[PDB]
Amino acid sequence: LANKFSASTVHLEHITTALSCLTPFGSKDDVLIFIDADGLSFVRENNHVIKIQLLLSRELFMSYSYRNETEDHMKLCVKINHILDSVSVSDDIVECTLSYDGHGSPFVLIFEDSFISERVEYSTYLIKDFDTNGLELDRERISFEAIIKGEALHSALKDLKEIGCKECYVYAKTEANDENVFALISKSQLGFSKIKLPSNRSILEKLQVFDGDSTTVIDGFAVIGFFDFTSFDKIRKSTKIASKVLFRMDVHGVLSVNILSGIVIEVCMLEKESIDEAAQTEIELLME
Amino acid sequence: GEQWYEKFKPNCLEQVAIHKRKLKDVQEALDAMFLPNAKHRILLLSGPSGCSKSTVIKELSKILVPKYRQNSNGTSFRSTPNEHKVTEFRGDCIVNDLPQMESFSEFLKGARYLVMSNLSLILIEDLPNVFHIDTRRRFQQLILQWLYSSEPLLPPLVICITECEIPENDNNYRKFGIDYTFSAETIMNKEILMHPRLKRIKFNPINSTLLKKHLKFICVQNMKMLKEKNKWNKRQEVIDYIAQETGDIRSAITTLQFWATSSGSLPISTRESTISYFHAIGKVIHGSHSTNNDNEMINNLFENSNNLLSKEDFKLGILENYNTFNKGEFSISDASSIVDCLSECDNMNGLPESNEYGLREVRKTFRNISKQGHNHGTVYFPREWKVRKLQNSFKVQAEDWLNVSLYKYNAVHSFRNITLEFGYYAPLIRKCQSYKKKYILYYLKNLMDKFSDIMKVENGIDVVDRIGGPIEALSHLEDQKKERDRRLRMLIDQYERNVMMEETSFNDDPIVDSD
Amino acid sequence: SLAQQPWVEKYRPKNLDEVTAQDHAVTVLKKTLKSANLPHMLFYGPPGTGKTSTILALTKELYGPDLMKSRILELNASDERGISIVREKVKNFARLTVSKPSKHDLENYPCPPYKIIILDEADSMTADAQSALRRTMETYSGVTRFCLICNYVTRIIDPLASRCSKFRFKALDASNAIDRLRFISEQENVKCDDGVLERILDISAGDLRRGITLLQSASKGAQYLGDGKNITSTQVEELAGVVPHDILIEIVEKVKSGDFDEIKKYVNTFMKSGWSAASVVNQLHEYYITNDNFDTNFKNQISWLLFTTDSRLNNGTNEHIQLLNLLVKISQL
Amino acid sequence: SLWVDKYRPKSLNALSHNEELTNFLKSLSDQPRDLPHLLLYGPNGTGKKTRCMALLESIFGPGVYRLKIDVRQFVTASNRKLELNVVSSPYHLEITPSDMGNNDRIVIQELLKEVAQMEQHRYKCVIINEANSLTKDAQAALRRTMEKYSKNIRLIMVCDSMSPIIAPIKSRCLLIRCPAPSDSEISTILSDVVTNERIQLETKDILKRIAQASNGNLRVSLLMLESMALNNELALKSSSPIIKPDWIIVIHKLTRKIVKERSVNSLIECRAVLYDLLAHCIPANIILKELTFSLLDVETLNTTNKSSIIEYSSVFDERLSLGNKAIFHLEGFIAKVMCCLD
Amino acid sequence: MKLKLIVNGCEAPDDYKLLRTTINTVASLRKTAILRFNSERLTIISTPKSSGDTGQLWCTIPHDVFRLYTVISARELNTITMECNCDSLLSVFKRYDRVMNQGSSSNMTIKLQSMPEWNPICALGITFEEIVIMHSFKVPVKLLFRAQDTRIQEPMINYIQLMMYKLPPISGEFGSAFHGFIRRVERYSNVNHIHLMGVKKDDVELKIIVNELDWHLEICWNGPLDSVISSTHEVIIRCKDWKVCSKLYAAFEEVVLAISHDESCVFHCSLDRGSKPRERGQIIYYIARSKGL
Ligand SMILES: Nc1ncnc2c1ncn2[C@@H]1O[C@H](COP(=O)(O)OP(=O)(O)OP(O)(O)=S)[C@@H](O)[C@H]1O
Ligand SMILES: Nc1ncnc2c1ncn2[C@@H]1O[C@H](COP(=O)(O)OP(=O)(O)OP(O)(O)=S)[C@@H](O)[C@H]1O
Ligand SMILES: Nc1ncnc2c1ncn2[C@@H]1O[C@H](COP(=O)(O)OP(=O)(O)O)[C@@H](O)[C@H]1O
Ligand SMILES: [Mg+2]
Ligand SMILES: [Mg+2]
């Protein structure tokens, strides 16, 4: 089309499902959209402590046109009032097309049906001086890394949500004779509860506890990360559609979660400043 | 380990720190409420903290409930005799399948069943969250339903309200009555308080004699440690201090225990008591005996009773009662100065230092003319509320008159004119016209065109009385509103009939239930 | 609208070129036509000095009819401007990206890279709401510009007055706005005697809106009369509400002959005619101060007396009581 | 029907007093297309509302006098119900926001603006009774509402005092002074009324007394003429007593009491009369003015006492204007007057 | 005063569905409703004025629905006016609906009875069986005075400034598409005031808009829309009113829409019945301008 960026597709269900992963990050925040020949990137940052980045590949879109040769990518910002529900949708196929013509023009989403035509325009905003890329994982020093099934993690997160979890503990340990331990310990009004994943390959696949270096694997050291459940529960929806989840903790304490379902979601959340003595004692008792 | 005020609790009605007259009154009222068909249904006990309301209620229940409780025939829950003389409501109970506001209802709907063989005294000391507006409305509605209920039998209901002030908090910005005072008036409403089936008995702070007696008894009970620590010989003075510092028995016992347990010598202190409205007025007018420096007394009053002194009610009370100093026989210049100061304070947009200025001016003026030979008058609450009620009635009547004029004479007038001239001239004109109409009708009957205008005056609609009543100087609302609504409906019907131009009926044709 | 609008509304300046007596700020506003460097503005001045007209003309000149509807957000007293509104709506509009101009507007209009928020009558805003506007005015200054219009500058908190370039709109008198009124009269074919326009401006006391309304009333009266005679000063004075000089002379004579009964009787008779206390007070001040037949001490006292009575009147006091007290007090002196 | 309303003129030509104002109204109605906003200020009872209705009739025909009433509900910020009886006609509208006290601003924002946005091509006329009773916030809100939508609606306002009107509103409106009728005109009107009513009179001097007891207010003049005629069996004699409003007599008796007894107990007793007068919804300012000018009529007092009385009255009138409660200032005025008299 | 009504769901299912729709609609709008039993038809009224603002609902049901219809009264046309809580009747109707779904030929009997155990206050003795268990319900109700009943009147809509819009049948090929069109706007969180617009020359088209400083929603219809025997007709209405209209459209076939520019919206539903043809029951909903232009 006669626009800088114009995409059109028929697999609206996949786009709606992927975009539904951005609901838990609130409704008073903003969403950054990166437009590039590779595809689309959706970025959200909350409390300067958690960030989510969802990638939509070119192959997903039936037709893609990026005529802004001046810049290799375009940045824009949109307010999340109810945009989650807008891209949500009977028997007849529905064609979804996204249009954007440089800065200063609205982001247009048009749905074409047999007899119904929908068009929605979103105004753009000045890009916040805050850099959403400031939170990232250092690959040189990874405290540990784990691979888990999406269904089990989603069930565990739902269980923690039900009991009104207030604080979360990610506990990782690797020992000899192929002993792998990954647990979530919730501090809530119930007290202290523990959910431990099994050692079966089908659920928990492959684990390292490097101790910081990403080269040498040691056995006996336990990595503990303390998080606010408010940030930890923002990945439950992303995990519901997940087919595989990759967890990574660095020495600095940043948690990285890669969600694979050809749509990839990368989430980074920070660890709490300190651990109380009572919590550490209860963790030790629970793991003995 | 056990605190003394709990360890040394009354074991009988004779050990309760309650005056004989109040105890006898409570006994008589409660005994009356226990009768088969008792006129009174609720006992509302209101008083300060630690005046032995719940204590005396429980002690009297322990004696009364066994007397009237009907004997069972093996229908008791357990083998025990069901020692449940008092059933109390717990405000922090959170059951699973129940909204919070419905908790008290679920209590009351159960409490009704505790009668006859299951007789039990229903005590409500831990109120629900009455600070929540919806919860308070539900509580008031439930109490009204209890009072207006139509069951042959109900159990006695006792509500003990500890009247205390609510300190000015940052998290609260509303300025309702309950946000200022936690008392029966703010929790209940006029209809409940004025109900003929509700009896209200006000408790007083425990007098010094009973406090001294009970403190002496407590000291006598603990004699080994007091003698060992060498505090026996000086106990009396301490007790006296407590007796003249607080009227709260629980606080007094706590302070006595704290003093006794201390190995060294710590100054004796008790909880602070808020100065009442009339006590504050008296402090401002006649001064305080405990202090001679007016500045210190005023600073203490402002720091400890800012909530009471900030309201315009206190200023109005000062204006109303400043004339009772010497029964009014004092220099008019002082009265003029006081009133001028209050008027100028009224222009300071309710700043706290405006109140400071007003109170300090009143105190200084009264101290200047103070003398030993003074006889005082009676302190009265300002009557601004009565003026407001009369104004509301006047507004309702003026609205009714305006509606009548609009729908019967095609005339619209301002309310200001109603207040100024119409409200007096029009009723007089209508009354005299009606009198002349009666005279003409009687003359014609004995024996209209000449005085057709007078013939058009209708007695059933036209107002023939002064709005707000005659000005008696120098020689309720629901009924008026319903009358205005009825007159408006009649006027609308007449206007519609002109435009085109009854329970007796129902009783005359009772329904027919034919199958 | 040529014959179906009030003269004040029909002659509202459309462009900055026709603003009469605000050159000190109109020049600054014009030179930024091609600067892309418009700062935050605080216009303050007495009523009817040409503040709203100036900002409207500026917006029209910079953006034009098509782009004005998208680059301008106007709020006034009639709109609800609580602290929540300032936090949400104003902030959201300020953070918005400027809409892309078309080819025509770019060809014919500067189309600056920033929008405008016009908070007319900002003196009616609460202190907290004004405080909420402080950092928003600064964070999004690269895409948004603020304009606050007021009559009482003191009602604006100091931080906002510091954050905004201040423009004072001077009062318009016979030496600043005679040309505009003469142009309006010429286009309306209004006939009047020499000096009538100057008298109307003087009566307006620094408000061209009042002068235009008075001119319209005088023209209506002349047309109804249908005598083909120039309008004289007497008619404009009578329609303005100025007390006649004869009544002022009689009041002065009553005051000079100190007598409470006579003074109060005459005051009752005068106030039963509907005259405004402000006009008579102003006339008395003029007569007493400009007269050279009185001593310095009497003028010193009467100045304070008149000031106190005028301050009382501005508070919404009973005109009858205040006028009687003023007359009695001057009689005592 | 009340003689005040049943004789209300229904046309500009019918007016028989203040011919200059009638001619000005004729001139205004000559070209009813560019009529600016009007603000009629004048003493109460002059006939300002009658003149406004006559102008509306002369402009938009006789449908204006066919009044209709409706109930318009208002919701405030705190979800509070407000009821304002909206008096509307097919050609004009009437409102009294003063009845809403400090909430009148909402009426300016929700009623006037909504109707102004609606397009009628002619304009609608809106009347605001007791304009001087409007709060400053409402007056401020009226400014841009009037300026922006002058095409659709032209505003008419009525007041007895322009002092409580903010400068912007006076700038935005065309001021019209309404002089009160003189004694002669009131006498002629009363003479016509009595002649048409077939009521008996002895001498015209009685009418003059009726003119004097009112002293400008024609409404009370007619009301008390009717009261006297009915009381005297439709026979007005020279010696027939004049009937005054009850609160007037109460205020005069209070003034006599103040003069007689300058004591604290006298102040306490007068407080009850002040409470009764306020309970009759009598404005505090009018109470103060009437008390002051009844005190100033006492023959016993000398020049100094009267000067002090008027000074205190003005000071306490300002305090009432700036104050919340009214009892303080009235009681202070009475106490200071009594102190000075003693 | 004698009231006796007999209803059978199995016989004449269409009119039973009409009654279900009326009861559900009245119970989904307010707490109490007016029931006028006349010698010819039954009227159900949901109006703010009881014994922009909220809309009004008027349902007319022919007397031929009820197998037995005995309405006797001392008033003109034997009119009986009652005020009844919508929730109680709605619960009884759910009970009857589920009983019928279970499979039974029982008839619902409605009678008016006086209650001395409890503006006279009476009860409705709704009784039906369930295959046997006897189901009985004493629904409280208030008898309304003749004048008070006369006060309530049907709103009148100008027919010169109003243009009717014919909607496709729900059972037609375009019925599902139009239902989806209607429900498009019932899935946005903060949207509360929708903007209906109708453009003449598809002979006519209907659009739904939502304008906001940040959002711009706009839905077009491309199906064949007919006009019942000038192009600018817009009205702003609350989302609850549009949802009620959406639910109403899903039940009836001959649905008609009308927009009185900046004045109001009218939603008319009729149920054709064969025989001349019997009286056509109607459901009319009036919605006032929520905000307006
Ligand atoms: N001789 C005594 N008489 C009364 N109470 C006593 C006595 N000795 C100890 N107490 C205790 O002192 C406390 C005060 O009595 P309460 O009746 O609970 O006070 P209150 O009237 O209920 O005021 P609140 O609302 O509970 S703060 C109770 O815990 C009593 O058991
Ligand atoms: N400088 C001026 N040049 C020409 N006409 C003017 C000027 N100032 C005022 N006017 C006229 O008077 C009217 C007053 O309009 P505004 O500009 O809104 O006055 P204002 O300065 O806003 O007064 P306030 O502060 O809002 S009460 C204009 O519409 C013009 O008709
Ligand atoms: N020119 C006039 N001729 C005869 N009666 C008049 C005239 N002007 C006013 N009135 C009478 O005065 C009465 C009250 O006037 P009103 O409209 O209340 O004056 P205002 O608006 O100043 O209060 C009216 O009922 C009317 O009959
Ligand atoms: Mg207790
Ligand atoms: Mg302005």
Give the list of residues 6+ apart from residue A284 with CB closer than 8 angstroms, or none. none
The DSSP string of B203-269 is: --PPPHHHHHHHHHHHHHHS-HHHHHTT-STTHHHHHHHHHTT-S-HHHHHHHHHHHHH-SS-----
Chains touching D (at least 3 CB pairs under 8 A) are B, C, E
**Tokens 């085109």 found at:** B500
The SS3 call for residue E202 is: coil
Domain with residue D105: its CATH number is: 3.40.50.300
Closest listed residue to residue D199, CA positions, set A161, E84, B450: B450
CA–CA gap between residue D161 and residue C315 (Å, rounded): 12
From the list B249, B162, B173, B147, the residue with the least C-alpha distance to B207 is B249
Index of the ligand 2 atom closest to the CA of residue C47: 27
Report which of B420, B501, B493 is spatially closest to residue B460, judged by C-alpha positions. B493
Domain region containing D18? 3-177
Nearest-angstrom CA–CA distance, B284 and A58: 83
Q: What is the distance of C-alpha B376 from the center of its chain?
A: 27
Burial, C245: exposed, middle or buried (Cβ in 10 Å; 0-12, 13-18, 19+)?
exposed
Instruction: Output the CA–CA distances (angstroms, integers) from residue C79 to B396, C68, C124, C152, D60, in the order listed.
Output: 33, 20, 11, 19, 31
Distances in Å between the Cα of C196 and the Cα atoms of A261, C191, C232, D23 are 86, 10, 7, 22
Technique used to solve these coordinates: cryo-EM
Q: Which residues of D209-248 are buried (b: 16+ CB within 10 A; e: fewer)?
A: ebbebbbbbbbbbbbbbbbbbbbeeeebeeeeeebebbbb
Ligand 5 ion: residues within 5 Å (CB): C 52
Closest-CA residue to E284 (of E251, E256, E259, E263): E256
Q: How many CA atoms lie within 13 A of A28 on its CB side?
A: 5
* Contact (CB, 8 A) for A66 and A58: no
Question: How far apart are alpha carbons C201 and C211 in whole angstroms?
Answer: 6
Q: Are A108 and A12 in contact (CB under 8 A)?
A: no
Strand, coil or helix: what is E14? helix
Query: Which of E72, E143, E147 shows the shortest C-beta gap to B506?
Result: E143
| Ligand nearest to C-alpha C9 | 2
Q: Are B430 and B463 in contact (CB under 8 A)?
A: yes
Q: Do chain D and A touch: 3 or more Cβ pairs under 8 angstroms? A: no
Name the phi and psi angles at B368, rounded to 5: -60, -40
Q: How far apart are the first and last CA of chain B?
A: 77
Tell me how far apart the alpha carbons of residues B402 and B416 are, in angstroms, rounded to a whole number: 11
CB D339 within 8 A of CB B333: yes
Backbone angles phi, psi at D302, to 5 degrees: -105, -175
Residues D123, D28 share a domain: yes
Q: Is C22 in the pocket of ligand 2 (CB under 6 A)?
A: yes
- Pull the structure tokens for residue A134: 């400031």
Strands (E), E53-187: 56-62, 68-72, 80-85, 108-114, 121-130, 133-143, 164-166
| CA–CA gap between residue C76 and residue B131 (Å, rounded) | 38
Domain count, chain D: 3
End-to-end CA gap in chain C: 56
- The set of residues, in sequence order, having a beta carbon less than 8 Å from that of B325 and lying 6+ positions away, is B285, B286, B366, B369, B374, B376, B377
Local structure of B42: helix, strand or coil: strand
Question: What gap in Å lies between CA B48 and CA C276, rounded to an integer?
Answer: 59
Residue E243 phi/psi, 5-degree rounding, is -65, -40
Touching subunits for chain B (3+ Cβ pairs under 8 A) = D, E
Letter string b/e over residues C260-287, b meaning 16 or more CB atoms within 10 A of that residue's CB: beebbebbeebbbbbbbbbbbbbbbbee
Residues D266 and D136 in one domain: no
Separation CA B159–CA B139 (nearest Å)? 12
Residues A20-33 as b or e (16 or more Cβ within 10 Å = b): bbbebbeeeebbbb
| DSSP assignment string, B86-128 | EEE--TT---SSS-GGGHHHHHHHHHTT--GGG--EEEE-S--
| Residue A74: partners with Cβ closer than 8 Å, 6 or more residues away | A4, A5, A34, A35, A36, A68, A100, A102, A103
CB proximity list for E52: less than 8 A, separation 6 or greater? E288, E289, E290, E291, E292
* Distance of CA C76 from the midpoint of ligand 5 (Å): 9
Q: Is E195 helix (H, G, I), strand (E, B) or coil?
A: strand
Q: Do residues A121 and A106 lie in contact, with contact meaning Cβ atoms separated by under 8 Å?
A: yes
Cβ-Cβ contacts under 8 Å for C136 (sequence gap 6 or more): C86, C90, C91, C94
Same domain membership, residue D200 and residue D56? no
Residues in chain B: 515
Encode D276-294: b = buried (16+ Cβ within 10 Å), e = exposed: bbbbbbbbbbbbbbbbbbb
Q: Are E68 and E5 in contact (CB under 8 A)?
A: yes
Three-state secondary-structure class, residue B5: helix
Of C219, C213, C224, the residue nearest C11 (C-alpha): C213
At CB < 8 A and 24+ separation, what contacts does D238-244 make?
D238/D202, D238/D203, D238/D205, D238/D206, D240/D206, D242/D209, D242/D210, D242/D213, D243/B428, D244/D213
Q: Cα–Cα distance between A162 and D93 in angstroms, integer? A: 60
Cα–Cα distances (Å) from D144 to A10, C251, E292, in that order, read: 51, 39, 20
How many Å apart are CA E8 and CA E13, to the nearest integer?
9
CA of B17 to the centre of ligand 1 (A): 9
Q: How far, in Å, CA of B486 to CA of B484, rounded?
A: 5
In chain E, the residue whose alpha carbon lies closest to the alpha carbon of B505 is E74
The distance of E233 to chain D (nearest Cα, Å) reads 15
3-state per-residue secondary structure call for chain D: CCHHHHCCCCCCCCCCCCHHHHHHHHHHHHCCCCCCCEEEECCCCCCHHHHHHHHHHHHHHHHCCCCEEEEEEEECCCCCEEEEEEEEECCEEEECHHHHHHHHHHHHHHHHHHHHHCCCCCCEEEEECCHHHCCHHHHHHHHHHHHHCCCCEEEEEEECCCCCCCHHHHHHCEEEECCCCCHHHHHHHHHHHHHHCCCEECCCHHHHHHHHHHCCCHHHHHHHHHHHHHHCCCEECCCCCCCCCHHHHHHHHHHHHHHHCCCHHHHHHHHHHHHHHHHCCCCHHHHHHHHHHHHCCCCCCCHHHHHHHHHHHHHHHHHHHHCCCCHHHHHHHHHHHHHHHC
User: Count of CB atoms within 10 A of residue A2's CB?
Assistant: 8
Whether C140 and chain A come into contact, CB under 8 Å, resolves to yes
Do D115 and D9 fall within a single domain?
A: yes
| Pairing of the two strands A264-269 and B42-47 | unpaired
- List residues of E whose CB lies inside 8 A of any D CB: 53, 262, 292-293
Report the SS3 class of residue A114. Answer: coil
Q: B42, exposed or middle or buried, with CB in 10 Å at 0-12, 13-18, 19+?
A: buried
Rounded alpha-carbon distances, angstroms, from residue C126 to A85, C155, D166: 37, 9, 19
* Distance in angstroms (rounded) separating the CA atoms of residues E176 and E199: 22
Q: Alpha carbon of D286 to those of A245, C318, D281, D313: distances in Å?
A: 82, 9, 11, 11
Final residue of a structural domain among D236, D255, D271: D236
CB E1 within 8 A of CB B509: yes
A7 DSSP β-pair partners:
A64, A98
The span from the CA of C311 to the CA of C278, in Å, is 10
What ligand 2 atom has the least distance to the C-alpha of C53? 17
CB C119 within 8 A of CB C148: yes
**What CA–CA distance (Å, rounded) separates D191 from D10?**
20
With a 6 Å cutoff on the Cβ, whether B55 touches ligand 1 is yes
CA angle B47, B48, B54 (to 5 degrees): 65
User: For the purposes of burial, counting CB atoms within 10 Å of the CB of A281, is it exposed (0-12), middle (13-18) or buried (19 or more)?
Assistant: exposed
Q: Which residue from B512, B503, B508 is spatially nearest to E3, judged by alpha carbons?
A: B512
Residues D25 and D173 in one domain: yes
Spatial contact of A248 and A145, defined as CB atoms under 8 Å apart: yes
**Identity of residue B494:** Q
What amino acid is encoded at B226 in this protein?
A: L
CA distances from E174 to D81, E164, E215 (A): 46, 19, 29
- Residues of chain B immediately before an interruption (C to N > 2.5 Å): 447, 475, 501
Q: Max alpha carbon distance in chain D (Å)?
A: 69
**Ligand 3 nearest atom to the CA of residue D43, by list position:** 22
CATH of the domain at D216: 1.10.8.60
D331 and D206 in one domain?
A: no
Per DSSP, helices labelled H in chain A are 12-19, 83-86, 150-162, 229-232, 236-240, 277-286
Cα Dmax for chain A: 66
Alpha helices in chain E (DSSP H): 13-27, 86-103, 146-151, 175-183, 239-249
Which residue(s) pair with E268 in the sheet? Answer: E256, E284
| H-helix or E-strand spanning residue B21 | helix B20-33
Instruction: Look at residue D199 and tell me if it is in a domain.
Output: yes
Closest CA to D111 of D80, D133, D142, D140: D142
CA distance A234 to A254: 16
Cα(B292)–Cα(C244) distance, rounded to whole angstroms? 65
D82, D106 Cβ separation under 8 angstroms: yes
The helix (H) or strand (E) run that includes residue B427 is helix B423-446
Domain with D278 in it: what CATH number? 1.20.272.10
Name the token pair of D42: 């004048």
Q: Decide the pairing of beta strands E56-62 and E282-288.
A: antiparallel
* C23 contacts C99 by C-beta, under 8 angstroms: no
Report yes or no: A202 and A193 within 8 Å, Cβ to Cβ: no
Closest among A162, A153, A130 to A255, alpha carbons compared: A153
CA distance D250 to D277: 8
Torsion, CA B106, CA B108, CA B111, CA B112, rounded to 10: -110
The owner of tokens 């009286």 is E279
D140 within ligand 2 shell (Cβ under 6 A) = no
Quick one: D93 and D16 in the same domain?
Answer: yes
- Between strands B42-47 and B198-202, the pairing is parallel
Q: Please provide the DSSP assignment of B454-477 as one string.
A: HHT--TTTS--S-TTS---TT--H
Which pair of tokens denotes residue C307?
């000031």
> Which residue is closest to E263 within chain D, CA to CA?
D118
CA atoms of A75 and A52, how far apart (whole Å): 16
Size of interface C-E (CB pairs under 8 A): 4
Contact E266, E284 (CB under 8 A): yes
Q: Nearest CA of chain B to the CA of E212: how many Å? A: 33
DSSP-assigned letter for residue E277: P
C135 C-beta neighbours (distance < 10 Å), count = 12
